[PDB]
Subunit: 241 residues, 2 copies
Amino acid sequence: GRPMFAVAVNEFIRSAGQDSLCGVPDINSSGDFMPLHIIVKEVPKVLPCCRRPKIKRTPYTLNDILDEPCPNQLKSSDLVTFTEPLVSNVKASSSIGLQILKHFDSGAKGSKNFITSASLGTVVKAETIDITKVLAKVRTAKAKVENDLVSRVMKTKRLCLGLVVETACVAAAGKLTEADNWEISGHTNANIGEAVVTATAELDKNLSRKIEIPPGTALAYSFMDLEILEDRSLRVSSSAG
Amino acid sequence: GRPMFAVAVNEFIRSAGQDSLCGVPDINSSGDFMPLHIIVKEVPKVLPCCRRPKIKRTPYTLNDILDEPCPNQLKSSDLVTFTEPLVSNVKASSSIGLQILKHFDSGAKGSKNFITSASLGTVVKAETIDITKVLAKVRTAKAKVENDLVSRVMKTKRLCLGLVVETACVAAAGKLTEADNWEISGHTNANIGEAVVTATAELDKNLSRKIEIPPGTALAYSFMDLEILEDRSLRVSSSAG
């Protein structure tokens, strides 16, 4: 489930060829990785900034963080349509493979690999209506010290903020989410509601698991590093992941 | 040159589909990114572990760092043969594009993109003969406090070490390097000495620059994080970049 979703996510990212893309961690968290949402990077307390930071969802958006409002309207358009499954092999010993084996109650009966097949259908791109206006607000606004995330970020040096600016999602019939503020898009001829991932034991075709990826689910996203300066002003920069 | 090499590197990495791969920064540094070489990650003093670390070549290898020797023999084999050029577009405003424009003395005469074409020929994979034996030595050996890199790493918390374990290189007729300790490989039917990258002004086909990538040049590599514990013992872990 959560590992088989990661298979879908990794497959899309490997096919897209964009280095900046980050994977969405689970289906349940999808809504937290839409444009204008805020993510946090916290570097593990054990490691001395010698490990990649851990990226964590938050419930906040940019407007929860700015002293003055800012345009929150988003748009979505079709990005790619996969007409064939994305096929890979996962070794049972890898992190993903052990996670998958957890779902097989009696084990995989000696299988050393899982054959994974991800049918993604139509994937769409969500983004702000006018990224220029949002960047302009970042130049002009200040951070609300009232905000608890803002306070914690300004007092701690190990909390770093990220601003999601673009998200690749599996298609939906209408609005991708109800919580975010979407322009009314179009009813294009696309594949909706058929995204599915399967994993099969290498040594038993009848030993498989399968998850549906619900319409609208975010698969991957790109974000900008968001710095809060000591005078509460802001600055965004392009990240790499 | 250095930007057009980065075009080659990024093209290979985008084609390979391995998330762990890191790009070699320049042709001149290639030898420092072969298996068993040591890299350093230093996080910028300005950023509070909120930026990706900067990866830096060093002149050291694992045996410069261990108290006891360790097998240093490497092997190489053919990985992929590109039969067609890898074609992309670089915007003149991007970091890579401005770097490329520096090489055009009078400017690009208003061109907003560069058409880049990377002919990589046969790319080979360099790796240790027996990674198991090297990991075993990492489990058993200690770090030489005599070593200046070792001392600096143990006293500072912002210096992190990396151990290169696999390198993708453009093919060579014989040994990829003279400095490293290679087994004698094979004289396979491969394309050697034809790797070239070109960039052309979008608005003038007669305005171009071109670099040759010398046989044996490392393009990308994967590394393990190498930790020195307070008791001078060691530990490696898989990285992601």
